[PDB]
Amino acid sequence: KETAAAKFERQHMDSSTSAASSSNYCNQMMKSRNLTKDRCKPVNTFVHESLADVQAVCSQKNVACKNGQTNCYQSYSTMSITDCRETGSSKYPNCAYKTTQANKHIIVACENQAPVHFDASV
């Protein structure tokens, strides 16, 4: 089944809008991208930029990952992102999320020139 590159797109890419339109953005996308199937993923970020622009981040500023790995990369420019984070009332299989809009640099782990993990924002 899924390649790590394709898992990145599915979990993290919404190029269909420049910002989260409303507060129920996360409830709808966390479900429709299969991040609540087996359990509610606690936190997840959506990037509102071209696939081309996010892929390019792999050849921008080389940085350390939270775990101390050295294959992480930070965008030269801030990007439009939505942070998704489970509410206190959330319980599998009824997973509920807080939506938060932000313009921040994305830090991604790359493999064979492609984004394969979303690590942090600054």
UniProtKB/Swiss-Prot annotation:
It is found in: Secreted. Gene3D superfamilies: Ribonuclease A-like domain (3.10.130.10). Substrate binds at residues 7, 10, 41-45, 66, 85. The keyword Glycoprotein applies. Its main location: secreted. The active site is at 12 (proton acceptor), 117 (proton donor). This is Ribonuclease pancreatic. Its EC number is 4.6.1.18. It catalyses: an [RNA] containing cytidine + H2O = an [RNA]-3'-cytidine-3'-phosphate + a 5'-hydroxy-ribonucleotide-3'-[RNA]; an [RNA] containing uridine + H2O = an [RNA]-3'-uridine-3'-phosphate + a 5'-hydroxy-ribonucleotide-3'-[RNA]. Disulfide bonds join 26-84, 40-95, 58-110, 65-72. Glycans are attached at residue 34. Keywords: Disulfide bond, Endonuclease, Glycoprotein, Hydrolase, Lyase, Nuclease, Secreted. Belongs to the pancreatic ribonuclease family. GO terms for biological process: defense response to Gram-positive bacterium. Pancreas. GO terms for cellular component: extracellular region. Residues 1-13 have a biased composition (Basic and acidic residues). Residues 1-22 are annotated as: Disordered. Monomer. Interacts with and forms tight 1:1 complexes with RNH1. Dimerization of two such complexes may occur. Interaction with RNH1 inhibits this protein. One of its GO terms (molecular function) is ribonuclease A activity. Endonuclease that catalyzes the cleavage of RNA on the 3' side of pyrimidine nucleotides. Acts on single-stranded and double-stranded RNA.
